Write a protein that binds this ligand. Structure first.
Ligand SMILES: Nc1nc2c(ncn2[C@@H]2O[C@@H]3COP(=O)(O)O[C@H]4[C@@H](O)[C@H](n5cnc6c(=O)[nH]c(N)nc65)O[C@@H]4COP(=O)(O)O[C@H]3[C@H]2O)c(=O)[nH]1
Ligand SMILES: Nc1nc2c(ncn2[C@@H]2O[C@@H]3COP(=O)(O)O[C@H]4[C@@H](O)[C@H](n5cnc6c(=O)[nH]c(N)nc65)O[C@@H]4COP(=O)(O)O[C@H]3[C@H]2O)c(=O)[nH]1
Ligand SMILES: [Cl-]
Length: 242
């Protein structure tokens, strides 16, 4: 019944995911740090996204990925509940996984792998049913699923960007703007539907998007083109939550 609903969501949402943020971890009661075991080898990584029967994990390069290859691309992971507890009660049993895919990328002169891992036995049903509900909301595009990061003294310190200064380009002209908020999928900027390019100085990152709201200086809401978002931007937002 619950099992059946989870099987239906598995089929419906094959290939889809929910990116992690503070509010998602809170809802799911799932810590974002996770231990992988490959025989007696062990390493901690961070969850990037979760799906109905798989999840994506970030590790440093030259750690888990070669270790998995030596073990026929099988390992086990331990999900923990969203607390600092060291009690047995905070942990789910280790679950068997198999590596489906991996990519390589850079951050701050350090190299990382993003690993897609499939559960070889049922994920905890309490988590699976909530991931399916989040995927229903993502499909609908009727309400927000993630928090937006408001740009202020505290968040600018945590984000790996230097300031609130950015640029908006549209109709062959580039204007200054101030970033007011950021999220995985867009931004609100202030300055003085249309296609545009949002950019800011970084290690200039350019993101193509479309206007969604304007209101009066002018506050402009932007939806980044969903299939084109630079991995470096996505990881900047993920880093903020981690
Ligand atoms: N198309 C589009 N327009 C957007 C989007 N984000 C903001 N806006 C526009 O900007 C207005 C201000 O949004 P806010 O200051 O975040 O203030 C919002 C926010 O606090 C809240 N709100 C509305 N929808 C949601 C939602 O799905 N989730 C959450 N958490 N808050 C929401 O209600 C307030 C007023 O909402 P509105 O009267 O609708 O007024 C919204 C709406 O016209 C977006 O993703 N898409
Ligand atoms: N940081 C930031 N991102 C922005 C802003 N405006 C749009 N976006 C981004 O653009 C995505 C798609 O906007 P939508 O197509 O209007 O699709 C929106 C819209 O239909 C609705 N929605 C969300 N918030 C509001 C709101 O305040 N008011 C209204 N009327 N609808 C909202 O829910 C859908 C999904 O919202 P999200 O998952 O947040 O996904 C939003 C968000 O990632 C902005 O002011 N700041
Ligand atoms: Cl997502």
């Amino acid at each position: 019944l619950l099992s059946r609903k989870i099987r239906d969501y598995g089929a419906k949402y094959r290939g889809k995911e929910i990116k992690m943020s503070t509010e998602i971890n809170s809802f799911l009661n799932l810590r974002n740090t996770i231990e992988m075991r490959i025989g007696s080898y062990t390493a901690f990584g961070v969850i990037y996204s979760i799906s109905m029967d798989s999840l994506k994990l970030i590790f440093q390069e030259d750690t888990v990925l070669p270790a998995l290859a030596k073990n026929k691309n099988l390992g086990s992971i331990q999900l923990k509940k969203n607390s600092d507890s060291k009690s047995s009660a905070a942990f789910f049993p280790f679950l068997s996984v198999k590596l489906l895919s991996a990519s390589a990328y850079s951050s701050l002169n350090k190299e990382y792998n993003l690993l897609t891992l499939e559960f070889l036995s049922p994920a905890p049903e309490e988590i699976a049913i909530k991931v399916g509900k989040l995927l229903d909301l993502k499909l609908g595009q009727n309400q927000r699923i993630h928090e937006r990061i408001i740009i202020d003294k505290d968040s600018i310190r945590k984000l790996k960007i230097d300031s609130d200064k950015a640029f908006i380009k549209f109709n062959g002209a580039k204007h200054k703007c101030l970033i007011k908020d950021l999220s995985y999928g867009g931004a609100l900027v202030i300055s003085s539907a249309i296609d545009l390019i949002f950019s800011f100085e970084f290690i200039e990152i350019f993101i193509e998007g479309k206007s969604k709201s304007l209101s009066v200086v002018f506050a402009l809401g932007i939806a980044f083109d969903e299939d084109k978002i630079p991995l470096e931007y996505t990881m900047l937002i993920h880093d903020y939550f981690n």
